[PDB]
């Protein structure tokens, strides 16, 4: 059976009988008629809804943490995948792989109706990127979020605040390794690593960048992927954050992201070389410094440069201390937040040092990234 | 009549006759054929367009203020609701309830084609949240926006700049009580209240938070809903703004949001206890300080803490004045903007005090929230 | 042939035969049946997908620069236009008009399947805004982006980083004349002009605004379209940026946007009157100062005010220097970035002067706008 048909122009002056269907041959779609409306009611081709993703509560992430190693997709979630409508009318368990501490996972909704996590960010095992659609993810952290203001534990588990979906997520170039602070903005779970080009800015069990272990030079700002900066100036850390679509924290962000850490406490010892791992000679284990949001080594480990200027000024004369990119006059300090391993009682979620010019470089000054929260 | 049908895989190698319809039984949808294209043209199921909201001018809000107590939805607006397409092809009057000064209203598009406002943010009277879809809202203010630079009046009316829709709105956790400043960012209409957990940060006729009436402690940062902060430090006000997905204003934002206030004028008297209400012993009524955008008590009533540091520094020694969250060194002042009731000619949209450290607390220092503008 | 039909309520308790189609006469749509599901599967009317715009890689712009005067739309792009699905399954050349140095172009996808650029931002020549849909655009710059750190050339060409689409774009009120810096945020290609109300903030070959050529007073802040500010205070430039949904750069943004300029070099001579044109008596042509991202006159031409305070403070007394909008106490300097024509070796992507209060006005202090990056 072939329906009556015509071009869009032919349809424009045509009114079909009530409940008659015609085919618009310019559009290759069905047109429903009501006996009254010239041109009828053309229907949508499926490919105009490709990538549809509809949640019942758009103000919250699509997933709920149900236990340390379990999570569900929320009732009322509708997902287009590979030409099909896949939906969930009740909270539905996400099928999990083996989960490994300090690893990011992608959540896929698949055209067979299943929802599954995988460490692979292209496709989950057994599927392709056509049959499995990446819709979100989470961080499987090396320890719990802080329940109060005494840090967290060392039991690996899903960080509920690290759950993201394609419409509830960091406004950074990659969402991995970040956590949502107070529903307001996202912070890197880990201090910036040296190898951030390969690892992203926030990765577990990597060498921390600082004045004596400078980060790789950004490949968006003249780097070749091998060269590192000459030192740990604010300038270099700010440049690295920009590369990744992030920024250094301001004071309002810092006090929020670090809340839950053990206040007035520092790592001790002589160094903090590695993310999510005890410091060298540390008297407090790394988890003492986990925030409510699961920010790791949030205070008392390494100062983070901040995106705010004020405090002690440099000389009231033009000074060429920018790495060959011009001179500065009466340059205010750039903020440093959180304290470092040698800070004893001075460290905490509001610890702030306003002495250091942006050209300064020290083994206890590094960086943590933040970015805005995006709800679509 | 039952159409020929098959699975998606069966369809993949099938080319129907021109204008033939088949049914894909895996997808439960219609497939239109053109006699040429293998697999044909599958059509979209309605639930893949659930929540569709389409405006002719996406760069502007969906509604127009047509009078003090009247507004319309704009021509060209298409809204999915309860399985139906509801649209407006000409500007269409919004059906209003009784409007009460200082109250926020939700705008609903309903599956019967009507558009109506209500003080209830779940459903309008006579409907449910299934038959009525919340698409936006406005503030019915206690007085007019400023026409020039002499404040506003006390005639309750819709604030045109407070109109928001689900794709043109504050990037804060709740849009209520905010206004759009110069099309650029949103500001709280009201100074922060003590009871912000129950009221949100911006509510009419509530007790204003300050150093002598501290805000409720944020329940995202250890609060229980009853306890208040010990004082009115910058730290506490910044924490409260973060709770709500807001921040304190910077200087650029402050001068914009307060433009239209009566400059070089203060409330007078001895206190400003309540939002949108005259101060105690006030020589100027509250409306003298309304901005162009309908920001209430925009200057000359209470200083607002700002999200910027600089000016006078605290001691160049580690100082434990953060409420037990670490120490600060050479701490710059946090900005205070706008002047307060005792400011006489010093107050205004660019009044700025850079003396007070973030630990300071006074009865004339409070806060106002801002956030980014989101157009989707 | 008229299909069986009924209201939505009649459909609710009706289960059609497998592969039967009915018409819902309340919705004017087709309902597909499966012999099992009461109410069947209603299909979407086309107008619920009006404005659909779907890209294969939503993290990148929809277009690729293929040569100095050529560009393509990317494979996998699906566009709703005038009731039709228009798509591209391979990278497809954009049809170009004559291209003129320093001009912004709009890219349209048309209902005949073509994709074309035009200087007209309402419709391309030969089409209307109904048959041609504006989906993005670019800047055809007066010279190349910087390949290293020695500026660019004077060969007019598409600036690849200025490519924007309706889902990958500046979060400013108009996208024209901006470029994406490191994938992170957008900057104005040109310094602010006097006639920004008519031209926008970023336009080629216009008079640059500064203390001796003040910008037009914003019509959102009391301007009439003819009057200019009395001077070039920070306050006035910040107000202008707000008008356009922009802000002045911070230090992190400035060093990023100016990277690629010839460092420690200034224009020379006695003035830089005009955007994208040599300065008066200039010893370096304008293109010496083009950044990697195609920011023109990025350093060494005019200082830009910044959105950051610190450095040298004004008096610790209330001072009425805000243009009649209140007084300031211990007012910190507002940042100035980049150097100016008289800066010799002091200029560069990190040049920063923290001496000038926001009330100061000089012929070598102007402004450049930035804004956030939006990916939808
Ligand atoms: Ca500052
Ligand atoms: Ca700042």
Q: What is the dihedral of CA A151, A157, A159, A164, to 10 degrees?
A: 170
Q: Across the interface, do B263 and C332 touch by the CB < 8 Å criterion? A: no
Residues in a beta bridge with C301: C340
Q: In what order do the strands lie in the sheet with A77-81?
A: A53-54, A77-81, A84-88
The whole-angstrom separation of Cα A297 and Cα A317 is 38
Tokens of C355: 């001496």
Nearest to C242 among B1, B182, B299 (CB): B182
User: Which of A310, A313, A337, A364 is the mutation pick for testing B, counting most B CBs within 10 A?
Assistant: A310
Same domain, yes or no, for A3 and A87? Answer: no
Which of the listed residues A51, A68, A90 is the one where a domain comes to its end? A51
Experimental method: X-ray
The whole-angstrom separation of Cα C160 and Cα C141 is 10
- The answer to whether C306 and C342 are in contact (CB under 8 A) is no
Tokens of C323: 């243009």
Helices and strands per DSSP (H, E), number in chain B: 4, 24
Q: Is A46 left (phi over 0), alpha (psi -120 to 50) or beta?
A: alpha
The CATH number of whichever domain residue C45 belongs to comes to 2.10.10.30
- The answer to whether B289 and B296 are in contact (CB under 8 A) is yes
**In this structure, how many other beta carbons lie within 10 angstroms of the beta carbon of residue A154?**
14
The CATH number of whichever domain residue A224 belongs to comes to 3.90.1580.10
Q: What are phi and psi for residue A11, nearest 5 degrees?
A: -65, -30
Q: Which chains share 3+ C-beta pairs under 8 angstroms with B?
A: A, C
Minimum-distance ligand to the CA of B335?
1
Sign of CA dihedral A139, A142, A143, A149: negative
Sheet strands (E) in C191-270: none
**In this structure, how many other beta carbons lie within 10 angstroms of the beta carbon of residue C19?**
22
Collapse the DSSP code of B302 into the 3-class scheme (helix H, G, I; strand E, B; otherwise coil) and give the result. coil
Same domain, yes or no, for B359 and B373? Answer: no
The whole-angstrom separation of Cα B227 and Cα B268 is 31
- For chain B, how many structural domains are there in total? 3
Which of the listed residues A30, A51, A72 is the one where a domain comes to its end? A51
The whole-angstrom separation of Cα C191 and Cα C84 is 41
* Number of residues written out for chain A: 376
- The answer to whether A208 and A192 are in contact (CB under 8 A) is yes
The whole-angstrom separation of Cα A305 and Cα B92 is 53
Nearest to C307 among B252, B263, B353 (CB): B252
Same domain, yes or no, for A164 and A199? Answer: no
- The answer to whether B188 and B177 are in contact (CB under 8 A) is yes
Same domain, yes or no, for C170 and C59? Answer: yes
The whole-angstrom separation of Cα B147 and Cα B155 is 13
Query: CA–CA distance from B60 to each of B249, B330, C300 (Å)?
Result: 24, 45, 38
Tokens 């602070």: give the residue.
A181
The DSSP secondary-structure symbol of B74 reads P
Q: Across the interface, do B222 and A149 touch by the CB < 8 Å criterion? A: yes
Helix axes B251-258, C234-243, angle to 10 degrees: 70
Query: CA–CA distance from A237 to each of A217, A233, A284, C32 (Å)?
Result: 10, 7, 27, 58
Q: Across the interface, do C54 and A43 touch by the CB < 8 Å criterion? A: no
Tokens of A249: 């924290």
Residue A350 domain boundaries? 190-368
**In this structure, how many other beta carbons lie within 10 angstroms of the beta carbon of residue C100?**
12
Same domain, yes or no, for C59 and C23? Answer: no
Same domain, yes or no, for C351 and C207? Answer: yes
- Report the candidate in B253, A312, A330, B346 with the shortest Cα–Cα distance to residue C356: A330
Tokens of B40: 């044909």
Helix axes A251-258, B234-243, angle to 10 degrees: 70
The whole-angstrom separation of Cα A309 and Cα C251 is 9
Same domain, yes or no, for C182 and C258? Answer: no
Nearest to A310 among B34, B220, B310 (CB): B310
Nearest to A54 among B51, B238, B320 (CB): B51
The whole-angstrom separation of Cα B128 and Cα A13 is 39
Chain B residue numbers touching C41 (CB-CB < 8 A): 28-29, 45-46
Please check whether residue A279 touches C, CB under 8 A.
no
Apex B205 CA angle, B204 and B206, nearest 5: 100
The whole-angstrom separation of Cα B74 and Cα C339 is 48
Please check whether residue A259 touches B, CB under 8 A.
yes
The CATH number of whichever domain residue B76 belongs to comes to 2.80.20.10
Chain C residue numbers touching A134 (CB-CB < 8 A): none
How buried is C14 (Cβ within 10 angstroms: 0-12 exposed, 13-18 middle, 19+ buried)?
middle
Residues in a beta bridge with B73: B63, B92
The whole-angstrom separation of Cα C303 and Cα C305 is 7
CB-based contacts of C132, cutoff 8 Å, min separation 6: C81, C108, C109, C110, C111, C116, C123, C124
User: Which of B217, B248, B325 is the mutation pick for testing A, counting most A CBs within 10 A?
Assistant: B325
Q: Across the interface, do C326 and B263 touch by the CB < 8 Å criterion? A: yes
| Spacing of C-alpha A45 from chain mean position | 34
Which of the listed residues A51, A70, A92 is the one where a domain comes to its end? A51
The whole-angstrom separation of Cα B187 and Cα B168 is 14
Collapse the DSSP code of A304 into the 3-class scheme (helix H, G, I; strand E, B; otherwise coil) and give the result. strand
Tokens of A96: 């999990």
The whole-angstrom separation of Cα B274 and Cα B276 is 7
The DSSP secondary-structure symbol of A129 reads T
Q: Across the interface, do A221 and C148 touch by the CB < 8 Å criterion? A: no
CA of A42 to the centre of ligand 2 (A): 53
Apex B199 CA angle, B193 and B205, nearest 5: 55
The whole-angstrom separation of Cα B346 and Cα B356 is 17
Same domain, yes or no, for B74 and B96? Answer: yes
Tokens 């015509």: give the residue.
A6
Please check whether residue A326 touches C, CB under 8 A.
yes
Q: Across the interface, do B252 and C242 touch by the CB < 8 Å criterion? A: yes
Same domain, yes or no, for C329 and C228? Answer: yes
CB-based contacts of A24, cutoff 8 Å, min separation 6: A5, A6, A7, A8, A11, A30, A31, A42
Which string of DSSP letters, residue by residue, matches C124-175? Answer: -TT--TTTEEEEEEEEEESSPPPSSSS---S--EE-GGG-EETTEEESSS--
Q: Which helix (H) or strand (E) holds B236?
A: helix B234-243
- The answer to whether C164 and C137 are in contact (CB under 8 A) is yes
- Report the candidate in B207, B259, A333, B223 with the shortest Cα–Cα distance to residue C354: A333
Same domain, yes or no, for A226 and A324? Answer: yes
Q: Which helix (H) or strand (E) holds C10?
A: helix C8-12
| Closest CA in chain B for residue A347 | B326
Q: Across the interface, do B243 and A182 touch by the CB < 8 Å criterion? A: yes
- The answer to whether C285 and C296 are in contact (CB under 8 A) is no
Minimum-distance ligand to the CA of A253?
2
User: Which of B58, B352, B371 is the mutation pick for testing C, counting most C CBs within 10 A?
Assistant: B352
CA of A332 to the centre of ligand 1 (A): 8
Tokens of A125: 């095992």
Collapse the DSSP code of A238 into the 3-class scheme (helix H, G, I; strand E, B; otherwise coil) and give the result. helix
Same domain, yes or no, for C204 and C344? Answer: yes
* Number of residues written out for chain B: 376
The whole-angstrom separation of Cα C170 and Cα A166 is 20
The whole-angstrom separation of Cα B123 and Cα A365 is 53
Residues in a beta bridge with A228: A216
CB-based contacts of A11, cutoff 8 Å, min separation 6: A22, A24, A31, A39, A40
Tokens 């490994």: give the residue.
A100
3-class DSSP string for C255-277: HHHHCCCCCCCCCCCCECCECCC
Same domain, yes or no, for A112 and A19? Answer: no
CB contact residues (below 8 A), chain A span 163-192, against chain C? 171, 173
The whole-angstrom separation of Cα B154 and Cα B163 is 19
Query: CA–CA distance from A146 to each of A143, A287, A291, B222, C223 (Å)?
Result: 9, 9, 5, 11, 53
Q: In what order do the strands lie in the sheet with A70-73?
A: A63-67, A70-73, A92-93
């Amino acid at each position: 059976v072939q329906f009556r048909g015509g071009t869009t122009a032919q349809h424009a002056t045509f009114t079909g009988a009530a409940r008659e269907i015609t085919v618009d041959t310019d559009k290759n779609t069905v047109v429903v008629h009501d006996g009254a409306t010239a041109g009828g009611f053309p229907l949508a081709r499926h490919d105009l809804v490709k990538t549809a993703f509809i949640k019942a509560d758009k103000s919250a992430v699509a997933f709920t943490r149900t236990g340390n190693a379990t999570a569900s997709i929320k009732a009322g979630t509708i997902v287009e995948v590979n030409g099909k409508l896949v939906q969930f009318t009740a909270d539905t368990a996400i099928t999990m792989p083996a989960l490994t501490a300090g690893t990011d996972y992608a959540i896929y909704v698949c055209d067979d109706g299943t929802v599954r996590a995988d460490s692979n960010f292209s496709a989950p095992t057994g599927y392709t990127s056509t049959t499995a659609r990446k819709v979100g993810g989470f961080h499987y952290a090396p320890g719990s979020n802080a329940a109060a203001q005494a840090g967290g534990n060392t039991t690996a588990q899903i960080n509920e605040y690290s759950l993201w979906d394609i419409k509830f997520r960091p406004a950074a170039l990659d969402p991995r390794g970040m956590t949502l602070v107070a529903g307001a903005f996202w912070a890197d779970i880990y201090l910036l690593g040296v190898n951030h080009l390969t690892d992203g800015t926030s990765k577990y069990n990597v060498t921390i960048a600082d004045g004596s272990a400078s980060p790789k030079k950004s490949t968006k700002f003249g780097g070749d992927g091998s060269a590192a900066y000459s030192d740990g100036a604010w300038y270099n850390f700010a440049e690295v954050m920009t590369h990744h679509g992030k920024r250094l924290p301001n004071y309002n962000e810092f006090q929020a992201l670090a809340f839950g850490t053990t206040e007035a406490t520092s790592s001790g010892g002589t160094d903090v070389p590695t993310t999510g791992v005890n410091g060298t000679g540390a008297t407090s284990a790394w988890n003492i410094f986990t925030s409510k949001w699961g920010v790791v080594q949030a205070s008392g480990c390494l100062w983070t440069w901040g995106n705010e200027f004020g405090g002690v000024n440099g000389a009231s004369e033009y000074t060429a201390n920018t790495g060959g990119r011009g001179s500065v006059y009466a340059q205010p300090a750039a903020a440093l937040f959180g304290g470092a391993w040698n800070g004893t009682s001075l460290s905490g979620s509001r610890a702030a040092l306003w002495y250091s010019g942006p050209s300064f470089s020290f083994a206890f000054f590094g960086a943590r990234g933040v970015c805005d929260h995006l709800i679509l």
